[PDB]
Design a protein around this ligand. Structure first.
Ligand code: ADP
Ligand code: VO4
Ligand code: MG
Length: 754
């Protein structure tokens, strides 16, 4: 028979032949497993490409456009170490989990410069170049949105884009060294090992590269969002604090180790609940001194990763600081605060006749106060009392200590981002190309406010993609009278409203709890379920598909049905985590440090959730004002391994990211377009009298023919002319404004009229 695609539980789809049809279902015979059959629904079976070994660079070029052929085409490419594949002018990128030779080389960079989409193989570099060309030609700033769940490859692709644009369109080694070599610094302070990603970003960023009128790089600017705070003090056993702690412990000279009073990570509360092992290989393990290694490292050996290496990354980070222009004083200032936070965490309290510092904590107190430029008694007092003085219980002292740790580290991070921005400043610019790299969709056995905020942000980003690519695109077709078949899809605005709505949204209900005389997580949680009974996007934990979640009580958690999947959150500590305010007692202490660096870090209730919403909406305003390009990163498996394509997991991402819906729309859609009037007028200037007499519509048809299009490749709308997928190269030639180019084509067409 003719082979079709039919469901498979782990592969997503499998190859088979239809061997019966009935009023209720079909009967499929899996290829090669003849005699065996299974039933499938008619609506679940798809036509397959005749050649199962070939692949296409643009999925729109498939004979059959559907989720099954999309999946297979990406799979074949992935098997040949081609991680990049288009859907029209959108890029899908599947994490290879290893370094594929040469594909990011300076030679490869040069080969993408000025090349139209489709004239070179799919690549993150082509997306970057197209953003650059639109900026230069349309005179419009550009955003490149890199989406995907945790570990899918957003950060690595963001970095490829930045390297490409700076190496291609920035003059000198300097501006490259500055924008690119700034990255090891941000990652040291803002990235950490989670169970999904050894190099997980725990903050979001929008990095703008700014250009002058001549489209040459003049500088950069990084905006950062919502560093994860809880991580600073505690991690789960398979996770780590921010990389900087481990890089410093493994890599610092003896002189620096002594001065900062560092030791192996098992020695610090703020590291020792987490994995205390270093990333290292056989060689680099030899370069780490024995006195830096925890008992767990000594027993279990190092963590393995093809990229991360704590000792090697320390050295690389130090080299980075030098290259961008941090002096040694600035470096040591950074390290001193990092150490101060570590010693801060080692301070213990015991019930007094209030509470006191345990006798064993005297040293930690001395080291902390020293490193942060504080008087020991002031510090002791601020941790054990509050304001008329009031003595604190041990639990309260623990919280005060940790709150100070979190605020100090967070201000340190703010300084790092600012200092990076000061490495590539600019007074003015004409346009920018910005790249968005957020912390991606994630969930674990236990999900808290951190995951809730991250997933909320991912929800908002996916809504932007929907708004731009699925909603506005179709409204454009409609407005222009193209008669493109409407593609319906599940929108996630209702999910956003559940979280965001004034007064009754989850964030506002949380704020309300914070402002109550006796704030309670259980009270907040009940109010949410109460106000949103029968909301499609909200469930009580016992309804979870996973046994681990069902034991959670109704007022102890909730399930949000995110666009990317249901996530069950434990709501314990939501109220605490929602308050960004720091006690003035603690603030003044740090503000009045004897140390200038410490003071400069710092220049009842503040809603973390609503501060975040506000910052994200400002970001979204900026995105809306730009031309937007999209790279959809895909995580191939849950094991961080190479050449292990989990078809069902990948299909699920293709569906929820909207790529299946976009592929559908591209069956009759038109990804390129331009104003007819403007297009005609551009050529009109050069037209001999006979050609200028020619009907403008007829001229355009002749132009398109001359530049290689068939009538099915384009379509005139009311005011714009539209072009099909796969025709970007011809579109670009048609739109080319170079006076020499214009003249030649005008000559050619006017010749037909003799
Ligand atoms: N194109 C790529 N080439 C090589 N390794 C990659 C690529 N993309 C991702 N990786 C690997 O996968 C890991 C996670 O990718 P990353 O971009 O950090 O994920 P996220 O989407 O969470 O930012 C990286 O640390 C690196 O090991
Ligand atoms: O693991 V990532 O947070 O950087 O999406
Ligand atoms: Mg990342």
């Amino acid at each position: 028979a003719k082979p079709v695609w039919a469901p498979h539980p782990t592969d997503g789809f499998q190859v088979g032949n239809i061997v019966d049809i009935g009023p209720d279902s079909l009967t499929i015979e899996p290829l090669n497993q003849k005699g065996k059959t299974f039933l499938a629904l008619i609506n679940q079976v798809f036509p397959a490409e005749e050649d199962s070994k070939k692949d296409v660079e643009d999925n729109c070029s498939l004979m059959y456009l559907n989720e099954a052929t999309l999946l297979h085409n990406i799979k074949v490419r992935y098997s040949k170490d081609r991680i990049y594949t288009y859907v029209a002018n959108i890029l899908i990128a599947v994490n290879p989990y290893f370094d594929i030779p040469k594909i990011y080389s300076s030679e490869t960079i040069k080969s993408y410069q000025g090349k139209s989409l489709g004239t070179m193989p799919p690549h993150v570099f082509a997306i970057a170049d197209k953003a650059f060309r639109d900026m230069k030609v349309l005179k419009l700033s550009q955003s490149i949105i890199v989406s995907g769940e945790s570990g899918a490859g957003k950060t690595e692709n963001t970095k490829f884009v930045l390297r490409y644009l700076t190496e291609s369109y920035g003059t000198g080694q300097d501006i490259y060294d500055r924008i690119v070599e700034a990255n090891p610094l941000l990652e040291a302070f803002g990235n950490a090992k989670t169970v999904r990603n050894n190099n997980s970003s725990r903050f979001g960023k929008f990095v703008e590269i700014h250009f002058n009128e001549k489209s040459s790089v003049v500088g950069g600017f990084v905006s950062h969002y919502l560093l994860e705070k809880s991580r600073i003090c505690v991690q789960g056993k398979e996770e780590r604090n921010y990389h900087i702690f481990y890089r410093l412990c493994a890599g610092a000279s003896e002189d620096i180790r002594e001065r900062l009073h560092l030791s192996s990570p098992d020695n610090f509360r703020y590291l020792n609940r987490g994995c205390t092992r270093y990333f290292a290989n056989k060689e680099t393990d030899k370069q780490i001194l024995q006195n830096r290694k925890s008992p767990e490292y000594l027993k279990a050996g190092s963590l393995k990763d093809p990229l991360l290496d704590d000792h090697g990354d320390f050295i690389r980070m130090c080299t980075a600081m030098k290259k961008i222009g941090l002096d040694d004083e600035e470096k040591l200032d950074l390290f001193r605060v990092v150490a101060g936070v570590l010693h801060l965490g080692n301070i213990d309290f015991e019930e007094a006749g209030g509470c006191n510092l345990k006798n064993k904590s005297t040293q930690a107190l001395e080291y902390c106060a020293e490193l942060l430029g504080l008087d020991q008694d002031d510090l002791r007092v601020s941790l054990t009392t509050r304001v008329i003085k009031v003595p604190l219980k041990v639990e309260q002292a623990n919280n005060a200590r940790d709150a100070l740790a979190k605020t100090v580290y967070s201000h340190l991070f703010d300084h790092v981002v600012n200092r990076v921005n000061q490495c590539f400043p600019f007074e003015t610019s004409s346009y920018f190309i910005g790249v968005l790299d957020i912390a991606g969709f994630e969930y674990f056995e236990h999900n808290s406010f951190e995951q809730f905020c991250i997933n909320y942000c991912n929800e908002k980003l996916q809504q932007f993609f929907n708004e731009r690519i699925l909603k506005e695109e179709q409204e454009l077709y409609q407005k222009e009278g193209l008669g493109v078949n409407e593609v319906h899809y599940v929108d996630n605005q209702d999910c956003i409203d559940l979280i965001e709505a004034r007064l009754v949204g989850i964030l506002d209900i949380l704020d309300e709890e914070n402002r109550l005389p006796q704030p309670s997580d259980q009270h907040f949680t009940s109010a949410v379920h109460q106000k949103h009974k029968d909301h499609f996007r909200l469930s009580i934990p016992r309804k979870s598909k996973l046994a681990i979640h069902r034991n959670i009580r109704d007022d102890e958690g909730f399930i949000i049905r995110h666009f990317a999947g249901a996530v069950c959150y434990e709501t314990t500590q939501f109220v605490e985590k929602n308050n960004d305010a720091l006690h003035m007692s603690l603030e003044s202490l740090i503000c009045e440090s004897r140390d200038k660096f410490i003071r400069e870090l710092f220049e009842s209730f503040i809603s973390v959730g609503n501060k975040f919403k506000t910052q994200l909406n400002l970001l979204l305003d900026k995105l809306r004002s730009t031309g937007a390009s999209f790279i959809r990163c895909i995580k191939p498996n849950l094991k961080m391994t190479s050449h292990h394509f989990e078809g069902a997991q990948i299909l699920s991402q293709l569906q929820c990211s909207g790529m299946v819906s976009v592929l559908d729309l591209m069956q009759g859609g038109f990804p390129s377009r331009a104003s007819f009037h403007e297009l005609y007028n551009m050529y009109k200037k050069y037209m001999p009298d006979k050609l200028a007499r020619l009907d403008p519509r007829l001229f355009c048809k002749a132009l398109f023919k001359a530049l290689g299009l068939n009538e099915i490749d384009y379509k005139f709308g009311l005011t714009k002319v539209f072009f099909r997928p796969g025709k970007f190269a011809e579109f670009d030639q048609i739109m080319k404004s170079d006076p020499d180019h214009l003249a030649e084509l005008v000559k050619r067409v006017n010749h037909w009229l003799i």
